[PDB]
Amino acid sequence: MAEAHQAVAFQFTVTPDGIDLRLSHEALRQIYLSGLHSWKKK
Rounded Cα distance between 14 and 31, Å, is 23
| Residue 17 φ/ψ region, left for φ over 0, alpha for ψ in the -120 to 50 degree band, beta for the rest | alpha
The three-state secondary structure class of 27 is helix
CA distance 7 to 22: 14
Residues 6+ apart with CB under 8 A from 10: 21, 22, 23, 24, 27
What does the radius of gyration of the chain's CA atoms come to, in whole angstroms? Answer: 14
* Experimental technique for the deposited model: NMR
Query: For residues 3 and 13, what is the distance between their CA atoms, to the nearest angstrom?
Result: 21
**Of 13, 14, 9, nearest in space to 24 by CA:** 9
Query: Alpha carbon of 18 to those of 8, 14, 15, 33, 34: distances in Å?
Result: 22, 6, 5, 31, 30
